[model samples]
Target: RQGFVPAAYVKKLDSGTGKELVLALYDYQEKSPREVTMKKGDILTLLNSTNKDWWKVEVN
Candidate 1:
């Protein structure tokens, strides 16, 4: 993907059976970062950005 862009930064919860990925876009650019909450095993994808084509993953 040459021109691929990510809409938000995805992060996993500290503790869980599986990784809890959440896309926090709106919270990033906003004047105040929102404490978006979600239950374990919930896969959230924020679509508040213009570009949404990259599939980001944590290597470590």
Candidate 2:
């Protein structure tokens, strides 16, 4: 007889959907109204990275 199956939670291993944790390298007070301000050591999430010059992420 054969078993059912076996696997591991490896979704973020490839696609740009890691949603990994990030830290602000420095305070960022840009003029972009759509974007939020950033402080040193702030927490963030790497949402998407399908673009070279642009990446979608969430920050506090």
Candidate 3:
């Protein structure tokens, strides 16, 4: 609980819509957006949660 996860560099997206809590995932190499929707209880490891402009994460 409240611990860092491994390979935490995938779910890094600017923001989904205008919600602060909602996040978006994008392709690292392709520079394309992933069509996956994030829901509650979806565990994602944080890479750079400190950055408001770009919050990085990985799907767990």
Candidate 4:
């Protein structure tokens, strides 16, 4: 396996719910934070805030 670690894991939170739903993301090998790109089977990590984890609404 490569030493590549995802920047982070993304999830979605329902309105006022302390729960999260996972989202799909692009492959680490062909992705960069500089641009938006998503591939099948890839897991997306949502950007969290200092106060809490924000759920991602987009999958691509």
* Best lDDT among the predictions, by candidate number: 2
Better of 3 and 4 by TM-score: 3
Candidate lDDT scores, in order, read: 0.35, 0.44, 0.39, 0.38
Q: Candidate 4 on 1-60: residue-level lDDT in tens?
A: 112223354333454444333444435333434334444455444343333422323343
Task: Give the per-residue lDDT digits (tens) of candidate 1, residues 1-60.
Answer: 011124334543354555444533332222222333333333454323243644333221
lDDT of 2: 0.44
> What does candidate 4 score in Cα RMSD to the true structure?
8.7
Q: Least lDDT summed over 10 consecutive residues: which range in candidate 3? A: 1-10
Better of 2 and 4 by lDDT: 2
Lowest summed-lDDT stretch of 10 residues in model 1? 26-35
Worst 10 residues of 4 by lDDT: 1-10
Pairs that collide in candidate 1 are none
Q: What TM-score, computed on C-alpha atoms, does each candidate reach?
A: 0.23, 0.52, 0.32, 0.25
Model 1 TM-score?
A: 0.23
Q: Candidate 3 lDDT, tens digit per residue, 6-56?
A: 223334445555433323333233233632333344545454457444454
Give the residue spans of candidate 4 off by over 4 A. Answer: 1-21, 25-35, 48-60
Give the winner by TM-score: 1 or 2. Answer: 2
- Superposed on all Cα atoms, model 2 deviates from the true structure by an RMSD in Å of 15.5
List, in order, the clash count of every candidate structure: 0, 0, 1, 3
Model with the higher TM-score, candidate 1 or 3 = 3
